[PDB]
């Protein structure tokens, strides 16, 4: 009768749906990470403090707009707000910083001629239109569509020239200046990173960002170019590939294997592909990410109306819940937090919905399927991790506590989608920030010195997790928890599972 545990026991998905209960309150932990775009509504230290208290886990910076100086100040304010809670490490929540690349762009019933001749840069007119992509003719054929201004206008190419295309307008409207262009279904040969992106990525390395959301990723070689630009110095920065067109969807597998995770970039994706197909692409990407054990971000227009209003639409409530049910590691806000009224209310709403939806997951089937789909491996940590998730379902444990340096051991627990929150204790601050990318990891940053005796140093970090869970209201004294450690100094890796009562002290 709490946490949708009646529904959890159902023998079928249909009966699971039938037993979902609005009068079954959720547990206090919320597992899905919340990524908030920072902008004019949300940059002040004071607002960012409430933003964190409301449930922000990742600050997204959009490099489509704003100078290096502007963004450096946003990062500084994020860190000031974040570090204002640092005096009580029991209560300190790590907050990641994410850099979102601008990425390459194309810019600027009747007949309508596209031209590449630069004399028409200054005289864009309703008969002849200039764009900046010089290889457009190689990637388009007769029958190709061209979309202008976030898909407001639509053209179909009728004849192909050396330096020009003659098109027929399909969807009319008002054409302005310096408007965005999309090429549905094309193999676009724009570089993986623009001149501007190379500068922005180098800036992210300099600013110690935790992850990059790389725009318009179409193929594996694009991810590799981002990685090489990040270089040796930025090798620990996670690359989240943004899938935003047909080619990215079609080549998803190669992109996933090369990436540290994925953003379902529904905005541009829904311009590039028919809007009615976005949910298909969303569900396929979330499923394959869950199958690979790689973080996946659901982004854009979840709570859109809350830019103006203090409460979401029913479609928006539904969208957040269903992203979580699909299996998304990370819901996102894009302007709800950046420039809207009610930025705090939007964060709070994501928190509330995510938590409800986490209880409504059909763990019984999800766990079975994740186990059946997972390769066998001789890797001890993998075996320990699945063993720990199994044990956590068997005893309804209040948490799975994982000691981890790199984060990897906790990531391996999270891929099997326990109901119980995963308290990942690390001394590595970057590990703690990056762990937000994974469903159910509650990262905590241990600031105590390394004890001389290894056994005591383990017990110290375990007692820290115990204090965190009590203080955050995940569990109380006497409840059973699962503890994952290594057995032996820094040698080996996470291979030891203990089932322990939460102590009085």
């Amino acid at each position: 009768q709490t946490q949708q545990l009646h529904a959890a026991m159902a023998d079928t998905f249909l009966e699971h749906m039938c037993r979902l209960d609005i009068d079954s309150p959720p547990i206090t932990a919320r597992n899905t990470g919340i990524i908030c775009t920072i902008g004019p509504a949300s940059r002040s230290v004071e607002t960012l403090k409430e933003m964190i208290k409301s449930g922000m886990n990742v600050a997204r910076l959009n490099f489509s707009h704003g100078t290096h100086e502007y963004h450096a100040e946003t990062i500084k304010n994020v860190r000031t707000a974040t570090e204002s809670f640092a005096s009580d490490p029991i209560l300190y929540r790590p907050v990641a910083v994410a850099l979102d690349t601008k990425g390459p762009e194309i810019r600027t019933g009747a007949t309508l001629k596209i031209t590449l001749d630069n004399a028409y840069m200054e005289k864009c007119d309703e008969n002849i239109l200039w764009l900046d992509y010089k290889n457009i003719c190689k990637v388009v054929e007769v029958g190709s569509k061209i979309y202008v201004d976030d898909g407001l206008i639509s053209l179909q190419v009728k004849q192909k020239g050396a330096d020009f295309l003659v098109t027929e307008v399909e969807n009319g409207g008002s054409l302005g200046s310096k408007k965005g262009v999309n090429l549905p279904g094309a193999a676009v040969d724009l570089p993986a990173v623009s001149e501007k992106d190379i500068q922005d990525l180098k800036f992210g390395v300099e600013q110690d960002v935790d992850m990059v959301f790389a725009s318009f990723i179409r193929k594996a070689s694009d991810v590799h170019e981002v990685r090489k630009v990040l270089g040796e110095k930025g090798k620990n920065i996670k690359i989240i590939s943004k899938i935003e067109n047909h080619e990215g969807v079609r080549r998803f597998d190669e992109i996933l294997e090369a990436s540290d995770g994925i953003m379902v970039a529904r905005g541009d994706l829904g311009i590039e592909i028919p809007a009615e197909k976005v949910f298909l692409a969303q569900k396929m990407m979330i499923g394959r990410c869950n199958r690979a054990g790689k973080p996946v971000i659901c982004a854009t227009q979840m709570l859109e109306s809350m830019i103006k209003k203090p409460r979401p639409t029913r479609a928006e409530g539904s969208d957040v819940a269903n992203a979580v049910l699909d299996g998304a590691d990370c819901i996102m806000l894009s302007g709800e937090t950046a420039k809207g009224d009610y930025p705090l209310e939007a964060v709070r709403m994501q928190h509330l919905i995510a938590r409800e939806a986490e209880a409504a997951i059909y763990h019984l089937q999800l766990f079975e399927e994740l186990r059946r789909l997972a390769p066998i491996t001789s890797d001890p940590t993998e075996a320990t991790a699945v063993g720990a998730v199994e044990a956590s379902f068997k005893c309804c444990s209040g948490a799975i506590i994982v000691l981890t340096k790199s984060g990897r051991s906790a990531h391996q627990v999270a891929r099997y989608r326990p109901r119980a929150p995963i308290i990942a204790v690390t001394r590595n601050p970057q590990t703690a920030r990056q762990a937000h990318l994974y469903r159910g990891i509650f990262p905590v940053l241990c600031k105590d010195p390394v004890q001389e005796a290894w056994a005591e140093d383990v017990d110290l970090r375990v007692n820290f997790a115990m204090n965190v869970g009590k203080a955050r209201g995940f569990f109380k004294k006497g409840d059973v928890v699962i503890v994952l450690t290594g057995w032996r100094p820094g040698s080996g890796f996470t291979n030891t599972m203990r089932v322990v009562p939460v102590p009085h002290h």
Copy 2:
């Protein structure tokens, strides 16, 4: 490579999700019924014609506003537009008419009185008399009161003889004679208001197909609606609107008494915390699917399309997920009534519904629906499930059902075939009401009853075949499933044929 058939063959739900393919185009048939609220943007004969061509199946009339004269004119226009396609019965689409009833400082203190103060409406004077005489008896220590579609919130602090004193939880600017909601309360108001009795009588007179009854909280409310409809209105389907805590909690008794359900997310999300609406939606759609009774997902599905020609990504998602949940119908509430882009909103529901119907995991849904259905001696039940099984085995272009009452087609639809169900009837009301059920494409046979029974059956079967060819559901040489009876009357459906399309 078509209709997500690669995904359909997956052994797990996870692999099913992983195989969903934006390049696997859907079939032309669209199974989920589209209900459109008619209002100033959508009442003209000319707009209603395009509205039908765009995919409207049910015209909803909202008796929250508008006189009988106004609504009678809307109905007339719906029928004019509908009957403009009647010359080609191959291409004629039945269109149902539905009547929707309507029977009801941040910390600063406000006294609610019942003694008449309709003359004053200020923050100083505090919250007006309101119309609800029994309010004091149905609220307790702790209770909340929501005013103006949940904009303001009050928590009751003291309980008096004639009055209750509250502290406001959520402050704002308080207007006059606005809506009040009582979260978690057992509301004593009558099942149907004085106005609703008149509106229901008017619906009987205007030959409506169904009633969406507001604010159903218990079975005895459904029974009061049924009794008001009386003998005259016994064939009018009652769809109960679940819109508060008590209706959700008593859902089972309400379902049993109703012909179907509307998940009324608008008022529901004012009554219960908005984060829990999806819970209530999924539980109601599941239980409806389990009982074989129609369920409507309603309210803000494409809300932004009131102003814009394209929906948000959350809206696209919501429509798709309602279909995936199992909703028989989706609804538009002002997207069609008063918005710009009414046609584009209808078209978008059509497009999304079709995509989502292909992405259903039929393999698991069908297993579960079969296992959760009771065994029975009923031949029609056995025939219907036999027919759905056969339709999966040969990827049939349709299941053709001859039906007088609709019931035989309803029994097919509850097992959720992929194939569209072409329901051939001579009963015009049956044909209109069939739009309540996922996958039933009703067709109204206007040919006379032949002297020979076998010929009359074959006539109706060939009509369905012509409909399917003309609407692009199937072509010559594809296989279809045909359900008929052994005997003239309703309730003898027992014969299933697997036939190639001529």
Copy 3:
């Protein structure tokens, strides 16, 4: 509370096992065909009559022994006994005749009627030189398989006398093998030889088998059980030997060595069905592995929709005793649970003291086991493993099985000329008995190869009106079911017919109450 219907409703196999109920009596119908080897205990007209009444569906004739005249007399006696019930077509049970080939053999030579002792790890030279034909001793053994040296290597085993003796080849010659004895014992004359793991190149059919097959065609047998099938080309040689005249005779391949198991898929594809020939199979492969081969063959046959027979030593002790062992009860039940279309009796019916009791026991056990099948999972798996097809009859058949589970129907009634429509129903393993109405007497006999088909031979003339002729045959099935106690008035049955006179047009399913006669 009957037919293990509490167990039928379980959500798990484990709970299914847990709800199996000795106090839940089965229904009257028994779906698994019983094949009885006929011999001295069971050849008289009088014994064959009781044999039928006890539940024999198929009379098996073993051409390892007995002259043509002896077997012709057995066939005649089977027909006499069978046709003695033909005056009541309501109660007439078709009976198939099966010819089981001797097949190719490897045999030892002689030395009058004495034996010799092979010991421990003593040396034994096998020779192909015919001077040792009648001069076999404990130093030298003669065999008739001239190519043995080409198909065996250093390390190979050779088994002599139904696996009593075992040899390992140590040196390989032109015309000889020198072997070490592994398992000793008493070596007699003209004893059988097995070559575990070898690609034996003996012909598909022996000189004797050619005679026997010609005789089977002449005697109108329904099926051939072909021995020692090792590859698809063996099945095709049997088919070609049968030729045009024998083209309607079903070939059941007997899998009885390693190579036959390994090449099972090509053999199945070429065959009409399979016999799991556990006797010789358990001489060829370790005895502990036979259950593996049995379950693999039954599963793959169920998956292909081809008949499979479980054979040999099922009720072995009932050769001498009036009641079986607990392991034998278990073996029968588990063959049925595995999915076997037919079970078999060999010595138990051919030469034992208790032939009728053995038939009756198979009947009793089969019926209990059919109720204990977990239909819920079997049906789901059979449906998922079946290819989609545009074939109407396939869709009709699966639709009908689904409908039969939905209404707990007393039967599925199928009108069929060739048998095919009924076969298509049976492969989805309904619990309800399949009453297959045919006018073709061969169809009726052959239908026993399929789990659940109760064949009935309509003898009424073809009516002039097609609709009336259909109704006649449906009413016949209805009377059969009433008379056999499968259902009564008011119970629901499923009826499969066509739209049109010719075979391959079965596309119509009706769910009908059983009427008052």
Copy 4:
């Protein structure tokens, strides 16, 4: 391609069956315990030594026959043979001793006579007919028979050879019609199908035999003709304080025992599916039903279940089994039986060793052919949720063992319980249960997949070192017995503290060199 692992990966039971592979050889470990009845063919020290080497895990002693002196000698010989391997604890195999009671009986009076289908036979309870049993009048020793039978009831005489139907019911007599005739001898056993038999839970003789079992330090009792929970409790009380650690396996052998199976199982330490007498009591065609139901419910409750009687019956005379017998053993294993049993085959037959060896061979093949994928899913779904840490650890460990194809699950256990908890989830990998308790080690053979090993090293002063010693012992055992080698991954279960009840620690460890 080695342990039916292709079949293991199938998505359906049907495809699983289809992929079963005669050319996929099993691994070394054999999980199903083999119980051998000891008698004239198998009592010598020298035969018992080979018997152990062939795979006997439990020596069963049948107290239906033989004096205390005879059985004392059998037990002594079992211990001599068992302890002849004791010098190498790496290789030593514990061998349990089991006492099987005679139990209550109904027996005829006092040379044979012919009974005919259709003819009258009056049973009497007046003792003057003790010596004067004929074709018209029969003696039985069950005085309350009249109260437990009605008009219509059946009575079976001489292991079900003769069959009578009662037609009239008297004060101290029954008049019956013979259904199945035959030759009626003297002193023959009687069965009452479907009756609530009120004979005592234990006979006068059984009380003496159980007291003798306590004296002889037996590990378990197979208690005959258990019909209800209160029968198991009477056995427990007869065993008393001194025999409180002796496992009681209830023999289900009639209708009432099957019908009241749930209450019997709850009260018992395990069950024997006694197919012998069971198939006399109930129709033989229904035995498989009772067998499958009992094995399932035992698996579901996590209590040992023994499949007994006629498994390799023909091997009393022949060196090879029938195909039905091969099948029966395989299917008992597939059903889920913890142990398989040999009766005449080891007690009095030729080929006692070959019968043991055959059980070993078949058990091992059939353990590979189990569809673990479904069995594990079902067992974990059907198990109650619990706050018990050991239960969570145990299931965690089995899950981990599937994920890394571990060569073993090593469990430190005093009472056996922690290893029993692992075994009920039916891992593929063998469970090496390290104990210092020799009784624990013997009894663990009742549970599928437990390989018990008896640590004889002294208790080290430091507790952590003493734990590591026992883990290393298990590692040495597994290497030596060929379960795993250097570098393979294994699962190790220990606890946080000394004493029983504290197992909470699971380690995934590579096997060291």
